Amino acid sequence: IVGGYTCAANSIPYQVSLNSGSHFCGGSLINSQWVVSAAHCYKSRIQVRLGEHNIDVLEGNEQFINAAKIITHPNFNGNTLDNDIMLIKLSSPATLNSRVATVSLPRSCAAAGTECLISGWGNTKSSGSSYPSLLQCLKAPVLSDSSCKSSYPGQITGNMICVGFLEGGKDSCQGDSGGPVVCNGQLQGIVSWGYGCAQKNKPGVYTKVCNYVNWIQQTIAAN
Numbered sequence: 288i289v290g291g292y293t294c295a296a297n298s299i300p301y302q303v304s305l306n307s308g309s310h311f312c313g314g315s316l317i318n319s320q321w322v323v324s325a326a327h328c329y330k331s332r333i334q335v336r337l338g339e340h341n342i343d344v345l346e347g348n349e350q351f352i353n354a355a356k357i358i359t360h361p362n363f364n365g366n367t368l369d370n371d372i373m374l375i376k377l378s379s380p381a382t383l384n385s386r387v388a389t390v391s392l393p394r395s396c397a398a399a400g401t402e403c404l405i406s407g408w409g410n411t412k413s414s415g416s417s418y419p420s421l422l423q424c425l426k427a428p429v430l431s432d433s434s435c436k437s438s439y440p441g442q443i444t445g446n447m448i449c450v451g452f453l454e455g456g457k458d459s460c461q462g463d464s465g466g467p468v469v470c471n472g473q474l475q476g477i478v479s480w481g482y483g484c485a486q487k488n489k490p491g492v493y494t495k496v497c498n499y500v501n502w503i504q505q506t507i508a509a510n
């Protein structure tokens with residue numbers, strides 16, 4: 288997250304870190320047994336780390352649970368990033384408490400201008416690299432479909448939203464991929480792609496979760 292602030296510890300209890308020797312992507316806990324993330328994050332083995340704040344220190348409230356199933360969207364396209372969504376089934380249910388909690392799926396899609404919270408352990412520098420120990424947060428609005436499509440001509444599908452700031456300086460970045468965009472208590476976005484990060488007129492692009500509630504529910508019921 289570039290241009291953000293350090294979240295209060297455990298204040299984002301649905302945020303997970305996906306780990307395969309190190310942190311590589313975010314995810315969101317949406318049921319006791321299922322995390323949603325981005326398909327471009329796929330690895331064939333993943334450990335899910337729940338209840339994290341400092342990913343470099345054991346603080347005591349963590350739950351580390353291996354993925355038992357890793358299911359990418361069948362229409363994920365690696366060129367256009369359409370359908371950039373993945374579900375992970377945990378080998379055992381997460382134990383839900385104040386520090387490890389689900390986030391609701393969307394009841395509807397979000398109005399343009401809705402304020403959201405984006406979070407992750409991704410790069411914090413717009414020049415060079417700095418990967419933080421502490422979970423970072425960013426407040427950002429859903430942009431117009433107009434502002435989004437003008438920023439990336441021919442590249443925004445009906446399964447994508449832009450969230451962020453056209454001036455630059457405030458965005459998700461590499462390592463935030465797969466993590467949450469939560470607006471009015473609903474998971475509306477998954478960190479997906481962009482042209483670099485935090486650049487002028489290149490806002491973050493996010494998988495539009497309000498199109499996938501049926502796919503999510505169907506996959507959960509069938510696995």
Ligand SMILES: NC(=[NH2+])NCCCO
Nearest residue numbers: 459460461480481491
């Ligand atoms: N501009 C962006 N937010 N790009 C995607 C960040 C995750 O790689």
Ligand SMILES: [Ca+2]
Nearest residue numbers: 341344345346
């Ligand atoms: Ca920790």
Ligand code: NA
Nearest residue numbers: 437438439488
């Ligand atoms: Na432009």
